[PDB]
Amino acid sequence: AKTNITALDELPSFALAIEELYKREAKKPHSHVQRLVSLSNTDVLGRHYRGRDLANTRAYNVLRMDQIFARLVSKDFSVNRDFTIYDSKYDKVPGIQFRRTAQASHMLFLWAICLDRFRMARHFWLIGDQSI
Amino acid sequence: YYALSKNLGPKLIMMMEMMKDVSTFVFLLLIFLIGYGVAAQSLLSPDEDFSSRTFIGVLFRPYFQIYGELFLDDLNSEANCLGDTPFTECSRETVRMVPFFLAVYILGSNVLLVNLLIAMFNDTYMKVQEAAEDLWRKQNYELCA
Amino acid sequence: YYALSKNLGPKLIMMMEMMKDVSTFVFLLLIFLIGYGVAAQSLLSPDEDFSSRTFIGVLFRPYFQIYGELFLDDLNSEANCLGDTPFTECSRETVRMVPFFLAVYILGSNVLLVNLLIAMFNDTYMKVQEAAEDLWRKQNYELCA
Amino acid sequence: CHGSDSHMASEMLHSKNDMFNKKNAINIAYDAKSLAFLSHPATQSVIN
Amino acid sequence: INALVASRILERLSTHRALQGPHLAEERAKMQHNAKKFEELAVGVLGECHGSDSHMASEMLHSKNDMFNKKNAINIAYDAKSLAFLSHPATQSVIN
Amino acid sequence: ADWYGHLKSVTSFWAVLFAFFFPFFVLPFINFSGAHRLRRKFAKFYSAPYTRFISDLLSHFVLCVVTSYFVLDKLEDTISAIEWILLVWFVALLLEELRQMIFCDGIAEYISDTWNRLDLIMITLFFVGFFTHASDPSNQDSKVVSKGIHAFLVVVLWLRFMR
Amino acid sequence: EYKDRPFLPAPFILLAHVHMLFMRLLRLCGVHTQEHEKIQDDETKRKITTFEELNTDKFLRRWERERQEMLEARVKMTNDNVVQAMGMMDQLLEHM
Amino acid sequence: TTFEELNTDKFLRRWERERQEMLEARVKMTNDNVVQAMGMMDQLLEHM
Numbered sequence: 067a068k069t070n071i072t073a074l075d076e077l078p079s080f081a082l083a084i085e086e087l088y089k090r091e092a093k094k095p096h097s098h099v100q101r102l103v104s105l106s107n108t109d110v111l112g113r114h115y116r117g118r119d120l121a122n123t124r125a126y127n128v129l130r131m132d133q134i135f136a137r138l139v140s141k142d143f144s145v146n147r148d149f150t151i152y153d154s155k156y157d158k159v160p161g162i163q164f165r166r167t168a169q170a171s172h173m174l175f176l177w178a179i180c181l182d183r184f185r186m187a188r189h190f191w192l193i194g195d196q197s198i
Numbered sequence: 199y200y201a202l203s204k205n206l207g208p209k210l211i212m213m214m215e216m217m218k219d220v221s222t223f224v225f226l227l228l229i230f231l232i233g234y235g236v237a238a239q240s241l242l243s244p245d246e247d248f249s250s251r252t253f254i255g256v257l258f259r260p261y262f263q264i265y266g267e268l269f270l271d272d273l274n275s276e277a278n279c280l281g282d283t284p285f286t287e288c289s290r291e292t293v294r295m296v297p298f299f300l301a302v303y304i305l306g307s308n309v310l311l312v313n314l315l316i317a318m319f320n321d322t323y324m325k326v327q328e329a330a331e332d333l334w335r336k337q338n339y340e341l342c343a
Numbered sequence: 344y345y346a347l348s349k350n351l352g353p354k355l356i357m358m359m360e361m362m363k364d365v366s367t368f369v370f371l372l373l374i375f376l377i378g379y380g381v382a383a384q385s386l387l388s389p390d391e392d393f394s395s396r397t398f399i400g401v402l403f404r405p406y407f408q409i410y411g412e413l414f415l416d417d418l419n420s421e422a423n424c425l426g427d428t429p430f431t432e433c434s435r436e437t438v439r440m441v442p443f444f445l446a447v448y449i450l451g452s453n454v455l456l457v458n459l460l461i462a463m464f465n466d467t468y469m470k471v472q473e474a475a476e477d478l479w480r481k482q483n484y485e486l487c488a
Numbered sequence: 489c490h491g492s493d494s495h496m497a498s499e500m501l502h503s504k505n506d507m508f509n510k511k512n513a514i515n516i517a518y519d520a521k522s523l524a525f526l527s528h529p530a531t532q533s534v535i536n
Numbered sequence: 537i538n539a540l541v542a543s544r545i546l547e548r549l550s551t552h553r554a555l556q557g558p559h560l561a562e563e564r565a566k567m568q569h570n571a572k573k574f575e576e577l578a579v580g581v582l583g584e585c586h587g588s589d590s591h592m593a594s595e596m597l598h599s600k601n602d603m604f605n606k607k608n609a610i611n612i613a614y615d616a617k618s619l620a621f622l623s624h625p626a627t628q629s630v631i632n
Numbered sequence: 633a634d635w636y637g638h639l640k641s642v643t644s645f646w647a648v649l650f651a652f653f654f655p656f657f658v659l660p661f662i663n664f665s666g667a668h669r670l671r672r673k674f675a676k677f678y679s680a681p682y683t684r685f686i687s688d689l690l691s692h693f694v695l696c697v698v699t700s701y702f703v704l705d706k707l708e709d710t711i712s713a714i715e716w717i718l719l720v721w722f723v724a725l726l727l728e729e730l731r732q733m734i735f736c737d738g739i740a741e742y743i744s745d746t747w748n749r750l751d752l753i754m755i756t757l758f759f760v761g762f763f764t765h766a767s768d769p770s771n772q773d774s775k776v777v778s779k780g781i782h783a784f785l786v787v788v789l790w791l792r793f794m795r
Numbered sequence: 796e797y798k799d800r801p802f803l804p805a806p807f808i809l810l811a812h813v814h815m816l817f818m819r820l821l822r823l824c825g826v827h828t829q830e831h832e833k834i835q836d837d838e839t840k841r842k843i844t845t846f847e848e849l850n851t852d853k854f855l856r857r858w859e860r861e862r863q864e865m866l867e868a869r870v871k872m873t874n875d876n877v878v879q880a881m882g883m884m885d886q887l888l889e890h891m
Numbered sequence: 892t893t894f895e896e897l898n899t900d901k902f903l904r905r906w907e908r909e910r911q912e913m914l915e916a917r918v919k920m921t922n923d924n925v926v927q928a929m930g931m932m933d934q935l936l937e938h939m
């Protein structure tokens with residue numbers, strides 16, 4: 067459904083699909099992902115501020131998970147996302163197919179690290195960039 | 199500033215690791231030191247009011263007797279034994295048990311605990327030498343930064 | 344001329360190798376010896392002009408106390424404490440901390456550093472025994488030539 | 489990387505990455521408490 | 537003698553001024569590795585000689601070679617700092 | 633899990649020790665597992681085996697310190713107050729030894745343990761020394777012989793503290 | 796040992812001792828004290844039994860699978876397969 | 892970036908090649924090949 071937030075509405079389809087993967091794993095009993103999201107104490111955009119329907123229906127968006135992972139790494143993790151490059155007007159750019167791949171793989175990579183699926187993590191780590 | 203050196207810095211890191219074994223030795227040694235010290239101080243000076251000097255007598259000689267400095271001439275003088283043989287011809291027969299208690303104590307401390315500490319040090323050294331080298335390589339960056 | 348022998352020559356070669364561990368021990372020991380010596384010499388004789396005797400006092404007893412020869416009767420005499428219990432009833436209350444500093448120091452030197460040196464010697468011996476045999480076989484040719 | 493071209497590997501380790509507020513990979517490795525990465529000869533060569 | 541020469545040249549080249557450089561590190565390592573391998577070869581051939589005929593092997597080790605100003609193979613091995621060759625039982629038997 | 637009973641496994645030695653020393657000031661602000669709740673919190677904290685082990689340690693440590701003080705300080709011409717306290721404490725210890733002997737899996741299981749043997753040596757040494765002193769309290773020689781027996785007692789007590 | 800020991804420390808453990816003696820006296824002579832306990836249900840017992848049997852089968856299946864991934868077993872199994880393969884070749888050669 | 896990706900592919904290719912030269916992997920691969928060989932013999936015996 068359509069959302070009043072301009073940041074959430076800018077998100078492509080595959081981000082909503084990763085949110086669906088988080089939701090399917092989260093609905094399982096005694097799942098650590100749901101516990102992590104609840105104990106994170108963040109809003110819909112992942113900011114540490116602690117309506118209700120939007121905060122539960124879209125509780126597993128990629129930006130919020132990025133913020134949770136950001137506090138998990140160090141005090142200065144900040145992944146810069148650019149979802150504007152997935153529009154058809156940037157098709158003439160030479161290296162764009164790599165960037166779109168790399169960003170997508172990275173997001174899926176982080177999801178596979180969160181569920182502790184090593185094989186899927188290694189494959190998404192291999193396709194994208196900044197390996198080390 | 200010893201940490202820059204490839205010989206002294208890893209040894210510094212090992213020293214900090216061996217401090218736990220030293221602490222373990224201190225905890226085991228404390229049992230025999232306090233027990234022997236209270237027993238020996240009571241046998242050497244009976245019918246005396248408790249004071250700070252009693253506490254210093256409990257702590258002073260027992261600790262320094264594990265390093266090989268035996269206070270036997272001094273303990274013989276405090277025991278008021280006048281014989282040519284040292285702990286004989288004393289005023290009280292109970293004070294003649296001092297060399298015996300001591301005989302058990304340094305057997306407990308030097309023969310048993312010190313040699314056990316040598317074994318713990320050798321085992322600990324073999325276990326954490328590679329980790330000390332790795333820790334030195336991380337501290338190399340820390341000092342550089 | 345011990346190098347001809349199959350027992351003494353390799354042991355000679357090991358001794359030269361263990362000299363580096365001895366040097367490492369000397370560098371670690373120097374820290375505690377100088378620190379305790381300056382502190383202890385200042386506590387035993389305060390309000391005194393610096394002289395060569397001050398430097399000899401810093402170096403003399405601290406070094407020989409790690410071999411088990413405790414100068415406690417001599418330190419007690421220098422502290423001007425007249426009580427039956429040794430470091431009590433002194434003119435200055437600061438000099439009563441001498442047995443405590445010493446208590447830390449020999450814990451640092453005999454309990455910690457000497458046992459660490461034993462561990463380094465055992466590890467070093469196991470590492471370079473075959474190399475010492477090989478080096479002895481090269482020195483066999485050197486002596487023959 | 490160190491096997492192929494050590495200087496280019498050093499350049500890679502000195503490169504500032506946007507994902508961690510413009511600082512290099514050794515700082516990232518130290519912050520991640522990766523003792524194995526820090527103890528590696530290539531990283532130690534860059535640090536020396 | 538050639539195996540000793542190979543070990544000595546690789547060992548001296550690996551610490552030479554011409555091999556210092558960022559790109560030559562692996563190469564240097566390879567040189568050291570190859571040096572040990574050639575040293576092993578020199579030991580191995582020597583061992584075979586001592587297995588077949590020890591006296592003839594002793595005669596071989598005592599033989600003066602023209603390539604090193606008329607002196608024997610043990611002198612060459614010592615000059616090449618080949619500890620493995622010198623520690624071998626055949627060489628030690630000749631030295632004894 | 634049996635050791636900590638109905639308490640969280642992340643509790644340290646100092647936290648449980650502090651809560652033991654401050655029952656009404658540290659127990660509410662600790663989350664684990666209103667006379668309805670406060671009584672429940674006491675019954676859960678104080679029914680744990682860990683708390684009983686800590687209570688026995690502290691008790692044996694005071695016993696060692698108080699008995700050590702008693703042996704070091706001079707004996708009076710009559711039986712002192714500290715002697716009576718130690719007498720009550722060692723009869724209680726003897727009754728505790730009898731209670732563990734009766735409810736165990738035989739005399740052999742009890743005597744197998746080195747600490748039970750040490751307990752028997754503790755009780756035996758104290759009672760010999762106490763009756764030696766109590767036979768003639770004004771006799772100087774009796775006090776000297778009693779302190780001589782009690783010298784062995786303090787050594788065994790500190791050895792028994794290593795349990 | 797410390798599960799069954801009374802809570803109260805050593806100077807005050809006499810109160811606990813006389814309290815237990817008082818309970819023993821009320822149970823043996825008076826018999827005015829009722830004791831209550833809890834008995835496990837058959838459902839949870841059959842659940843534990845089912846769990847234990849399932850895990851027994853899982854460990855044995857895992858153990859057999861692990862023992863077949865060992866080097867000795869794989870070499871032996873490979874050897875028997877090659878022997879059976881030769882027997883089948885003898886049959887093939889007979890048919891030609 | 893190009894250097895790092897190329898070296899990532901080289902280490903993974905080298906790692907796979909190294910893992911296939913291990914004794915356990917070679918014995919397992921040899922075992923599967925002999926099993927597939929027996930299946931093909933069953934087909935051969937059917938044809939005779």
Ligand SMILES: CC(C)CCC[C@@H](C)[C@H]1CC[C@H]2[C@@H]3CC=C4C[C@@H](O)CC[C@]4(C)[C@H]3CC[C@]12C
Binds near residue numbers: 440
């Ligand atoms: C198990 C071992 C490590 C126990 C440690 C022993 C320590 C606590 C003991 C051993 C020797 C003791 C010292 C001996 C003598 C004196 C002089 C006196 O006028 C003041 C106390 C002082 C300075 C003591 C302080 C405590 C002391 C340092």
Ligand SMILES: CC(C)CCC[C@@H](C)[C@H]1CC[C@H]2[C@@H]3CC=C4C[C@@H](O)CC[C@]4(C)[C@H]3CC[C@]12C
Binds near residue numbers: 291292294295298
């Ligand atoms: C620790 C246990 C198992 C060992 C028992 C040995 C003890 C009890 C023995 C060993 C040496 C003994 C002492 C040796 C000499 C004398 C002098 C004598 O005129 C009175 C008794 C007295 C003072 C003895 C008392 C008992 C004694 C201390």
Ligand SMILES: CC(C)CCC[C@@H](C)[C@H]1CC[C@H]2[C@@H]3CC=C4C[C@@H](O)CC[C@]4(C)[C@H]3CC[C@]12C
Binds near residue numbers: 294296301
């Ligand atoms: C092999 C080793 C362990 C042998 C053990 C030595 C024992 C048995 C010896 C060594 C020193 C001895 C003590 C030395 C001096 C005295 C004082 C004397 O008035 C009574 C006996 C007594 C108390 C001795 C008892 C026995 C004793 C403790």
Ligand SMILES: CC(C)CCC[C@@H](C)[C@H]1CC[C@H]2[C@@H]3CC=C4C[C@@H](O)CC[C@]4(C)[C@H]3CC[C@]12C
Binds near residue numbers: 436437439440
């Ligand atoms: C090294 C640190 C961590 C340990 C601290 C212990 C020090 C500060 C303690 C231990 C023993 C203490 C001394 C014990 C006895 C006396 C006698 C008293 O009339 C004056 C103070 C004086 C001289 C004390 C000074 C402080 C002292 C030296």
Ligand SMILES: CC(C)CCC[C@@H](C)[C@H]1CC[C@H]2[C@@H]3CC=C4C[C@@H](O)CC[C@]4(C)[C@H]3CC[C@]12C
Binds near residue numbers: 781
């Ligand atoms: C069970 C073990 C640890 C304890 C050994 C028993 C002790 C408490 C007993 C055994 C023999 C006893 C000694 C026997 C005789 C004498 C002589 C007397 O004039 C003074 C007391 C003295 C010196 C006794 C002191 C206490 C003593 C040493």
Ligand SMILES: [Mg+2]
Binds near residue numbers: 191192193195197896
């Ligand atoms: Mg890639």
Ligand SMILES: [Mg+2]
Binds near residue numbers: 265266267410411412
């Ligand atoms: Mg000595």
Ligand SMILES: [Mg+2]
Binds near residue numbers: 729732747748751
């Ligand atoms: Mg008991």
